[PDB]
Point group: D2
């Protein structure tokens, strides 16, 4: 799994919005430590958390399992353009069988499958991958029908955009130890992809200081 | 699949809302044909389609594939509580093998899988189902790990709540022949599950 | 201000929804006290908050000031149909002057204005109300223009619908002492209008 | 009224998003003629219009009326941070009267009021402004109470963010001849503040 932050809204956009409520520009730093500190003090007060919505982040996500896509898509206050299995499963036509399950076929399978910490499941996923490319390549069955045999370990790719407020929500919900392992990884990857200057607005989301049982 | 409308907002909620913008209550016929056509007429003037949002429908959907869930979840202006593979895959631990593919095992497999119009794909789905069961039952692997080998054709179950405005959007987009067959079927099942008196509001959005 | 709950989703709906997640129906008592206990329990766990969304409330709000409407419409996850000033200001076309500010007039003025806890501002509102009446009655000036001289204490009427999850968020924010006094009343009024058994889902929001 | 686009998402963020769906990266020309044509073509196909949501526009709106704020706040798929009358009304505590009304005092009133195409209604606004000032100055009454005598023509200031998809919707709904004049102006203004490169994505929405 690889996550990249393709674009982000400059920090002061948020400080400029906050001061607009109280008309306290006279105390503006134009992006100085005072303004930055303001976004964190006001932006984190629930009644005024909406101020962080002005901050947007354009990410790219590679290698996420479709099973994890099921969960990512539930965060409805965000935008995504996802690789369609309906429009792209043909990618398995000109591909060699993944069986027998030898050392080099397993590695080849990783291009299309997300492996987890259990050799047997990974094996089964590859068996599902093989049967899938058999339907698509050897019997030219259409994507719309063949997709039904595809394992959720199958890899997806997506462009993902989300504002700061919704992102704190995502990180709080997914960095939690109650979330699927892969999703916890997505959460961290997202945070890490974030520009150093903005991370202070999301750090406490990985700490769970209000509900510590999540770590 | 199976869809049932467990509850819906009475039509007069929307006609009363509409008449509030203009305070045109004197024209109300108490939830009669006038108020009914008012909902459809004003509800279709784009600048006032929000008025339809007051209408809410609570559905129960049984038999939808995970692959179809993947698409349904993309309609954001809606609420849903879905059966979790992370919390319910232990349902395969003590079940009988799905192989061979005799009639009783295929019937049992249909309780867990959606079959499409291709005998080979379904055979494959049943094979993926069996491996999933084997991972869960004998190798006793935990849900968070085994769910990765689960085939998207696995059946899901969920409660689905959406308002009239978001529903028209769904029916329009998913009844299109551009949509996945299962989704087209979903749109139709959603429509057929709607109380008769309300269908006139969504009829124009179907097909 | 007056608030009325015209319709609401039955409780067992969120009850049936939560159980769909774990497929724990055998434990259900058909909306009983055990299922009712469930809604509040799981409903308060943040990762399952979404289960409260299946519950929808259809309210009618009378007498709210436009100044408060300014704040209420900022809650984006709700639906509303509001009396339009652009479309209904002629309601003043045929009304007798509100001056002098005697007591019988201060009373009539209340039919169109929200009075607060201060005689002087209320007086200014009537004067503003009177000047608005003049623009509309004597000079017959269009609504789109005359509306600019309307005091924010002018009353509005609206159909308001919102789900449990968003309502909790509302009651919590607007019942705070940090909230404009009128909004605090609105929160209390929405809570009081709720059917008996639904009120436990929102009780703590007022603390 | 003044509008400034403080920041925006580069176009290829959208073309990269679209291409991700079909994995058609090979035909990309890195935000060139091809990718631009792609946004306009795919981005306007309803089933794929969500691809435009990736473009975000950060604006600044100066001198908009509260009457207009009332309608602007109804577009819930957008973000806004608005000047608060509850926190900033004391700005009238040190201003001289606007009475008697005269070329000089009217001019001064424009600093706090939005004027319209009707001198009588503008005059009535200043009179409303004078009373609001009095409540705040002469009697030092709290903003929460005084604000009730404020005319909807009072000026506001806010930071406004919204994505391409929601913006097309807004421009279509507000540039319309059915919308209040000021909103038509805000629509035109927002569109003009956009960078030329992005205007071809909104031109058909406007007029
Ligand atoms: C550990 C874990 C376990 C889960 N288990 C299940 C499960 O078993 N079954 C299941 O179906 N889902 C499950 N989910 C999905 C989860 O319930 C939803 O993703 C979540 O409820 C959406 O809420 P959100 O806050 O993430 O909203 P987002 O959509 O990510 O963000 C929107 C925010 O806006 C508000 N909002 C948005 N839409 C609405 C609305 N329609 N009504 C009211 N407020 C709204 C909310 O306050 C929300 O926080 C689980 C998630 C986690 C992290
Ligand atoms: C035939 C078909 C093919 C598809 N192919 C792909 C594909 O290849 N890749 C892919 O990633 N997706 C694909 N999708 C997903 C689809 O693009 C999204 O589900 C859809 O765009 C979300 O828009 P909606 O109108 O369904 O919104 P819903 O979420 O169902 O409803 C919300 C409505 O509110 C508005 N709205 C909601 N959220 C926002 C927001 N964040 N910004 C602005 N306005 C908003 C919109 O006007 C929208 O119509 C496909 C869908 C269909 C029907
Ligand atoms: C005491 C008080 C003081 C206030 N002062 C000001 C002020 O000075 N200036 C001002 O402009 N406003 C002010 N407001 C308005 C307030 O900021 C908004 O009403 C509020 O931000 C809307 O947020 P919400 O959580 O109530 O969302 P709702 O719109 O009521 O509900 C939606 C929920 O979904 C989520 N959500 C919705 N939309 C988005 C989005 N676009 N991005 C991310 N998450 C989203 C949120 O988590 C939210 O809780 C004040 C409100 C109060 C109660
Ligand atoms: C000329 C004109 C006249 C008007 N007259 C009145 C009037 O008399 N009374 C009155 O009360 N209002 C009136 N309005 C307000 C208007 O009806 C609302 O602002 C509007 O309906 C909100 O819809 P939207 O498309 O602007 O949504 P936005 O909130 O701007 O954008 C969100 C988009 O997402 C979708 N969406 C968002 N929320 C929901 C939801 N809860 N359910 C379903 N889909 C959703 C929609 O497709 C919508 O287009 C008027 C507006 C105009 C332009
Ligand atoms: O950690 C979780 C568990 C469930 N879900 C939601 C989204 C899917 O629609 C459904 C998936 O359930 P699982 O297959 O992840 O168990 O419920 C999540 O978003 N995150
Ligand atoms: O008809 C479609 C095609 C794609 N998608 C969206 C939602 C999923 O996140 C992803 C699924 O692509 P498919 O697996 O359906 O091809 O894109 C749909 O909703 N409907
Ligand atoms: O308690 C408050 C204070 C401000 N606002 C938002 C919504 C309006 O757009 C604007 C109103 O500022 P006031 O007129 O309430 O001061 O900011 C609220 O919603 N609630
Ligand atoms: O052109 C209009 C007419 C009405 N409204 C909505 C939003 C406000 O809540 C209420 C305002 O009615 P007017 O004051 O604009 O007449 O209805 C608009 O957004 N735009």
């Amino acid at each position: 799994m690889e996550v990249i932050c393709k674009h982000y809204t400059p920090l002061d956009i948020a400080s400029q919005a906050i001061r607009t409520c109280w008309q306290s520009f006279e105390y503006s730093d134009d992006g100085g430590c005072k303004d930055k500190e303001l976004i964190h003090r006001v932006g984190n007060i629930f009644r005024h958390s909406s101020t962080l919505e002005h901050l947007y982040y354009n990410f790219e996500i590679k290698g996420l399992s479709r099973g994890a896509l099921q969960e990512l898509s539930r965060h409805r206050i965000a935008s995504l353009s996802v690789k369609s299995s309906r429009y792209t499963l043909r990618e398995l036509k000109e591909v060699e069988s993944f069986l027998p399950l030898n050392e080099t076929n397993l590695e080849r399978a990783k291009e299309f499958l997300v492996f987890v910490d259990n050799e047997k499941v990974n094996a089964m996923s590859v068996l599902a991958l093989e049967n899938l490319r058999i339907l698509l390549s050897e019997h030219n069955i259409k994507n719309d029908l063949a997709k039904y045999a595809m394992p959720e370990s199958y890899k997806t790719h997506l462009a993902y955009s989300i504002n700061a407020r919704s992102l704190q929500n995502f990180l709080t919900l997914r960095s939690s130890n109650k979330a699927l392992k892969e999703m916890q990884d997505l959460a961290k990857a997202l945070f890490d992809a974030l520009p150093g200057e903005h991370q202070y607005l999301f750090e406490d989301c990985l700490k769970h200081l209000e509900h510590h049982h999540h770590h």
